[PDB]
Structures are given as structure tokens and as C-alpha cells.
Amino acid sequence: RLFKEGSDVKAGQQLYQIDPATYEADYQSAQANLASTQEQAQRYKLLVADQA
Amino acid sequence: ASVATAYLTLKADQAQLQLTKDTLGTYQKSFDLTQRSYDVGVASALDLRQAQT
């Protein structure tokens, strides 16, 4: 718990932490696919200009 | 008959030369496209060598 109780908190201030540990694995599994598809799109962007 | 045969053979072989030049230009353009695709990283050297052959 990251807030002092009875204090004035602001909008968007983090109050807790709920042990990510699964969403970290989901995020890594998503970004590993994004890392390959992004450079495939970037390579085909260069090759489509030369009609390759 | 010999003169007519030799002249027609020359007339045929010059057109064969022109079509072979067109085929070589097509092959050179294909090799340049495969070299560009090897430079960007989509194809491998295994395809670049087959395009070179």
C-alpha cells in the first residue's frame, strides 16, 4: 500500500500494487510478437518502393 | 541455294541475339531485385546465389 491513510491523494496517484506476475508474462508475450511483426512491416515498407 | 540459306541463317541468328539480350536484361533486373531484398533482410544468401546462377 503506497498511500498514507487519511491524506489528500491526487488524480492518477498509485495507491496499491497487486503482484503483476501474470500480466508481466502477458506483456512479454505480446511485445515479443510485436517486435517481429514491426520489423517485417518496416522491411516490406522499403521493399514495396522498389516493387520487390 | 547456298547464298539464300546463309543469308536467312544470319537473319535468324540476329533476332536470336536480340531475344537473348532481352532475356539477359530480365535476368539482371531479377538479380537486382533479389540483391535489394537480401540487403533489407527479407531473403537469404541461399536465394541470392540461385539468382546469381
TrEMBL record, chain A:
Q: Where in the cell is it found?
A: Cell inner membrane
Instruction: Report the family membership.
Output: Belongs to the membrane fusion protein (MFP) (TC 8.A.1) family.
What is the name of this protein? MexA family multidrug efflux RND transporter periplasmic adaptor subunit
Q: Which organism is it from?
A: Pseudomonas aeruginosa
The major lineage groups are: Bacteria, Pseudomonadati, Pseudomonadota, Gammaproteobacteria, Pseudomonadales
- Parent sequence residues shown: 136 to 187 of 442
